[PDB]
Amino acid sequence: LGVYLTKKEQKKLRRQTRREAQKELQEKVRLGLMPPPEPKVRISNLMRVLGTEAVQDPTKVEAHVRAQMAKRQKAHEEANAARK
Amino acid sequence: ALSRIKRHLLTQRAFKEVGIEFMDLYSHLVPVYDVEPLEKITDAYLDQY
Amino acid sequence: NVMLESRFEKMYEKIDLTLLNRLLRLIVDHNIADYMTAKNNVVINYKDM
Amino acid sequence: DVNPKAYPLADAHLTKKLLDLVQQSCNYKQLRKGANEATKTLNRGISEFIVMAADAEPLEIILHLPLLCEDKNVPYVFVRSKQALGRACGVSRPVIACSVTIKEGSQLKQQIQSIQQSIERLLV
Amino acid sequence: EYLVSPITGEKIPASKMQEHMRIGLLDPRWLEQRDRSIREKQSDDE
Amino acid sequence: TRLYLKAEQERQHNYLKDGPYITAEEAVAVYTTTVHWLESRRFSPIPF
Amino acid sequence: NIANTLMAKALQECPNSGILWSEAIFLEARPQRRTKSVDALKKCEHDPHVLLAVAKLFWSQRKITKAREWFHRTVKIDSDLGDAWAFFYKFELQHGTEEQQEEVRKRCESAEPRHGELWCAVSKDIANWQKKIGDILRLVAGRIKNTF
Amino acid sequence: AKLWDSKMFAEIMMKIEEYISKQAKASEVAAPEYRVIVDANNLTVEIENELNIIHKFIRDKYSKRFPELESLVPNALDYIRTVKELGNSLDKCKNNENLQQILTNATIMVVSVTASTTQGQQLSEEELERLEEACDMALELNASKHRIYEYVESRMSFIAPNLSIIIGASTAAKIMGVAGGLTNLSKMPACNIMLLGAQRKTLSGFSSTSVLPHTGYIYHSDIVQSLPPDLRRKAARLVAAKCTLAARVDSFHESTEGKVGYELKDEIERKFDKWQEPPPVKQVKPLPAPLDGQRKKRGGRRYRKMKERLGLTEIRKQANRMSFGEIEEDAYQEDLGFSLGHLGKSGSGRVRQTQVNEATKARISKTLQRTLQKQS
């Protein structure tokens, strides 16, 4: 019959899988397969990443940041809908 | 903190080891004792009371 | 007129813990006396000793 | 087969449900591991059933559990593997005796009665 | 007996199950750490 | 420090092996004197 | 041993039974009477027979102050219940002073909130009911039918 | 009454069961011997219960004379022996050679001290003779218990072979008698076997650890006592668990020769050797080479928090600024070097008082929070 891996064993398996995916992404970025990741910017983060450009064109920066936030939300809802 | 102190006074009879050093006065040695701070609070309150 | 100045040579090192516990129970709550005399009986540590 | 003194010994179909319910009770903080804790639960009258393995090295270290279960009127059943019972207990080490304990308002109650009825059917 | 692997999706003998779980998730960075611990040890002088 | 701690270990082992160094008569005399003093001064014990 | 098996069956089928639990305390041997027989029991319920059983267990351990405190708690929580007055009187006579025993006996006097049905509680719990027991009471014609 | 009824029960038991035990013991010098072991294991329990009754009666009777000795002497047998030796005459309490055996020298001072300040009045002749007869009965019962334990030690080569292999027959008998017999000891959890025969020794001022709490026959057995004191609780736990396994094996009369007993004893010795194994060789880590150049360090929320915690604060900025030419009075007596600087002194340029940077608050570590969760 089937067997049940313990909670520590589940944690180890999940950690190893996450590290494998993270290394996959890191080596893809190293070799130029994927573009290097952009900083994740929220509203409270807007003045730290885009601070110098948000004084010249504040509303363009706000629109870009909110577009990034929506795209992050867009992918999550898209994955949820495709999985459902 | 007061509740913990009273609990230690009532039920605590075993304690962790305390370190010892010796202040060198160049004429004799004065023992110096390092107690755990958690027990130090209880001992200080007991002394004051 | 004769004046005698002296000191108890090793009073700190010769206070019997059982007798001290009894004498403390004389003046303070037996729980407090037991706590104090048990606190006086702990592991003295220094480096490897 | 391998161990004749083991009785009652659950079959393949029942042992799957036994291990699944043991794992579920572990997820609900309702399981005790080891012969000593099974004995403690039987003495305290908190265990509603007791599982154990049929491959203990002496087999006499969990053989007092059937007697104590008869004394306390608690169903008991044997499985053919200690390692699988330990895994179902969420423990890497093999377990040769596990106890499922009474809880107030637990949602595993119906499965508990179902497994107890099956265990009673196994005996005799 | 034979058991299905919760880590590999394959059937394994029941006797090797404990070792199978023990070494089926041996973190490869443990091997990396052992390698770099032995590379420095060989290069150590007296 | 090492020498003093070795001597202290010897002293503590001597006390443990040889028991209390205060005879029961001496302890009784000390305790009776303390009790009489406390009774004379009308001392109420310190409560918890 | 058969008594222990029957008691285990009875508690399992009928939990929260104050008298059954109180008697199961005294089936179990002295080493296990406290750590397992009365702790989970106090967890299960707080029947007047339960508090009386705890006081009896403390008395059997010669903890006089704890026994008196638990007996006072039993009296306060429920009077004229569980026939605890007989055991309280016996314990006060054995350990308590004569003045304390007399005060307890006076407090055991017939009163609607306290010891109104003390004889009835004794007959119900200590199984002192008899054919002539009811006739001995004030309700010779009435309590005789109620009593055994 | 209860003293007499217990005497009648003891006499009835000794007339039949003790006589049968003596006859079976002297026989080797349709009437089996297993039933003799069963009734001896019943006798030890009956004697323990009636000895508890006798101790209760003695304590109740003696509370009139010396109402504190029960707390000072917790053990029942030691209490009985002490009340037998002391009696109404507490004047002989000084230099009691007869009390050094009954009580340790630590509690002899305590009882002698307490006897000097006791309010208990003297007993009467009837009370004295009743107490003395009760003490004599208690000592007779103790002697009978010792005899039956000797018989059980002799028979443990036959009744409990594995458990006698793991631990000596003396400890085997002392745990089997106190547990109520082989079956009751085998139905007992391994954690409750290590606590069998654990006298609640009263700490006489000393700490609880000195009195070795939660200690029983197993701990005082030969194999456990053959360990350094820092390694004896673990040895007691391991030996108790293996003894429970051996007892469960023996209660079904399996492995009569003792194959399981040796299979457990040798692994006990293996565990003991592993615990006492010399520490392995650990290489000394050399000091890191002095560091030159640039190493890129990340910045972010963690770095911002660390910089806020470690960076200079406004009040700590004013602390290290001292006015030139304006001599200030000494603030702290114990340390003349200590000075507030511009803090609280004119010339700092701040009209209002500087506030405390709450990011520099002192709080306990994460692992110290865990201990507080295990304490409350």
Helix (H, G, I), strand (E, B) or coil at H173: helix
Distance, in Å, from the CA atom of D7 to the CA atom of D79, rounded to the nearest integer, reads: 9
- Residue G43 identity: K
Cβ(H174)–Cβ(H216) under 8 Å? no
At what resolution in Å was this solved?
A: 3.1
**A5-10 — which CB contacts under 8 Å span 24+ positions?**
A5/D87, A5/E6, A5/E7, A5/E21, A6/D87, A6/D90, A6/D91, A6/D92, A7/D90, A8/D92, A9/D92, A9/E21, A9/E25
Q: Please report the DSSP string for H177-228 in residue order.
A: HHHTSHHHHHTS-HHHHTTTT---PPPSSS-TTTT--S--HHHHSHHHHTS-
Q: Do C45 and B18 touch (CB under 8 A)?
A: yes
Number of H helices, E strands in chain B: 2, 2
- Residue A22 identity: Q
Q: Enter the tokens of residue H339.
A: 């000075």
Quote the radius of gyration of chain H (alpha carbons, Å): 34
DSSP class of A40: P
Best B2, B4, B13 member to test H by mutation, with max H CBs in 10 Å, is B13
Cβ(D43)–Cβ(G32) under 8 Å? yes
Contact E1/D at CB under 8 A: yes
Q: Do C23 and F31 touch (CB under 8 A)?
A: yes
Q: Exposed e or buried b for every residue in F8-24, given b needs 16+ CB within 10 A?
A: eeeeeeeeeeeebebeb
CB contacts under 8 A, C 4-33 vs B, are 31-32
Nearest CA-CA distance, residue A84 and chain D, Å: 26
Cβ(G83)–Cβ(G125) under 8 Å? yes
Query: Are chains A and D in touch, 3+ Cβ pairs below 8 Å?
Result: yes
Cβ(G87)–Cβ(G55) under 8 Å? yes
Beta bridge partners of B21: B32
Distance, in Å, from the CA atom of H242 to the CA atom of H231, rounded to the nearest integer, reads: 17
Nearest CA-CA distance, residue H13 and chain B, Å: 43
**A23-31 — which CB contacts under 8 Å span 24+ positions?**
none
Cβ(H143)–Cβ(H52) under 8 Å? no
Q: Exposed e or buried b for every residue in A25-52, given b needs 16+ CB within 10 A?
A: eeeeeeeeeeeeeeeebeeeebeebbee
Q: Enter the tokens of residue B39.
A: 């027990």
Distance, in Å, from the CA atom of G16 to the CA atom of G18, rounded to the nearest integer, reads: 6
Cβ(D5)–Cβ(D56) under 8 Å? no
Residue B29: its chain F contacts at CB < 8 A? 1, 4
Domain count, chain D: 1
Residue H112: its chain F contacts at CB < 8 A? 24, 27-28
List alpha helices for chain H, DSSP H: 2-13, 19-27, 34-62, 69-72, 76-86, 97-102, 105-115, 125-159, 161-166, 169-179, 182-186, 190-193, 217-220, 222-225, 232-250, 259-275, 301-310, 314-319, 366-373
Backbone angles phi, psi at G10, to 5 degrees: -65, -45
Q: Enter the tokens of residue H13.
A: 């038991």
Q: Exposed e or buried b for every residue in H291-300, given b needs 16+ CB within 10 A?
A: eeeeeeeeee
Task: Write the CA distances from D72 to D37, D75, G80, integer angstroms.
Answer: 15, 9, 34
Which H or E element spans position C45?
strand C44-45
Q: Do B22 and F4 touch (CB under 8 A)?
A: yes
DSSP class of D4: S
Q: Exposed e or buried b for every residue in D32-44, given b needs 16+ CB within 10 A?
A: bbbbbbbbbbbbb
Query: Please, what sign has the CA dihedral across residues D83, D85, D88, D94?
Result: negative
Residue A9: its chain D contacts at CB < 8 A? 92
Q: Do H203 and C34 touch (CB under 8 A)?
A: yes
Residue B6: its chain H contacts at CB < 8 A? none
Contact D92/E at CB under 8 A: yes
Q: Enter the tokens of residue G141.
A: 């014609």
Nearest CA-CA distance, residue C2 and chain B, Å: 30
Helix (H, G, I), strand (E, B) or coil at B24: strand
Nearest CA-CA distance, residue A48 and chain D, Å: 44
Q: Do H208 and B13 touch (CB under 8 A)?
A: yes
Residue B20: its chain C contacts at CB < 8 A? 44-46
Contact B34/F at CB under 8 A: no
Backbone angles phi, psi at H241, to 5 degrees: -65, -45
Task: Name the one residue in this structure whose structure tokens are 């606590």.
Answer: H195
Closest residue to F20, CB basis, from H93, H109, H116: H109
Nearest CA-CA distance, residue B28 and chain F, Å: 11
Task: Name the one residue in this structure whose structure tokens are 């070494």.
Answer: E23
- Residue D76 identity: Y
Quote the radius of gyration of chain G (alpha carbons, Å): 16
Distance, in Å, from the CA atom of H92 to the CA atom of G9, rounded to the nearest integer, reads: 58
Distance, in Å, from the CA atom of D84 to the CA atom of D80, rounded to the nearest integer, reads: 9
The residue in chain F having the minimum alpha-carbon distance to the alpha carbon of residue B10 is: F48
List alpha helices for E2-44, DSSP H: 17-23, 28-43
Burial class (CB in 10 A: 0-12, 13-18, 19+), D72: buried
Residue H229: its chain F contacts at CB < 8 A? none
Contact D39/H at CB under 8 A: yes
Q: Do C41 and H206 touch (CB under 8 A)?
A: yes
> How many pairs of residues across B and F have Cβ atoms under 8 Å apart?
9
CATH number, domain containing residue D40: 3.30.1330.30
Cβ(H88)–Cβ(H132) under 8 Å? no
The residue in chain C having the minimum alpha-carbon distance to the alpha carbon of residue F41 is: C27
Distance, in Å, from the CA atom of H59 to the CA atom of H73, rounded to the nearest integer, reads: 11
Residue F2: its chain C contacts at CB < 8 A? 49
Q: Distance of alpha carbon H59 from its chain centroid, rounded?
A: 25
Cβ(G85)–Cβ(G107) under 8 Å? no
Which H or E element spans position B36?
none
Q: Do E7 and A13 touch (CB under 8 A)?
A: yes
Distance, in Å, from the CA atom of D118 to the CA atom of D10, rounded to the nearest integer, reads: 10
Distance, in Å, from the CA atom of G45 to the CA atom of G38, rounded to the nearest integer, reads: 10
Cβ(C36)–Cβ(B10) under 8 Å? no
Q: Which of F38, E23, H171 is nearest to C28 (CA)?
A: F38
Chain B residues within 8 angstroms (CB to CB) of chain H: 4, 13-15, 38
Task: Name the one residue in this structure whose structure tokens are 């090192």.
Answer: C13
Helix (H, G, I), strand (E, B) or coil at G106: helix
Cβ(H310)–Cβ(H303) under 8 Å? no
Cβ(H189)–Cβ(D39) under 8 Å? yes
Nearest CA-CA distance, residue F24 and chain B, Å: 26
Q: Do H49 and G30 touch (CB under 8 A)?
A: yes
* Helix, strand, coil percentages for chain C (3-state, nearest 5): 50, 5, 45
Q: Which of H275, H247, H256, H118 is nearest to H190 (CA)?
A: H247
Closest residue to H207, CB basis, from B4, B13, B38: B13
The technique by which this structure was obtained is cryo-EM
If phi over 0 gives left and psi between -120 and 50 gives alpha, with beta otherwise, what is residue F46? beta
Distance, in Å, from the CA atom of A1 to the CA atom of D61, rounded to the nearest integer, reads: 26
Nearest CA-CA distance, residue D10 and chain A, Å: 13
Say which residues have a Cβ less than 8 Å from residue G116's Cβ, sequence separation at least 6: G79, G80, G110
Query: Are chains E and A in touch, 3+ Cβ pairs below 8 Å?
Result: yes
Around Cβ G111, how many Cβ atoms within 10 Å? 12
- Residue G84 identity: A
Cβ(H227)–Cβ(H235) under 8 Å? yes
Which residue segment(s) compose the domain that D74 sits in?
A: 1-124
Which H or E element spans position D116?
helix D109-122
Residue D46: its chain G contacts at CB < 8 A? 40
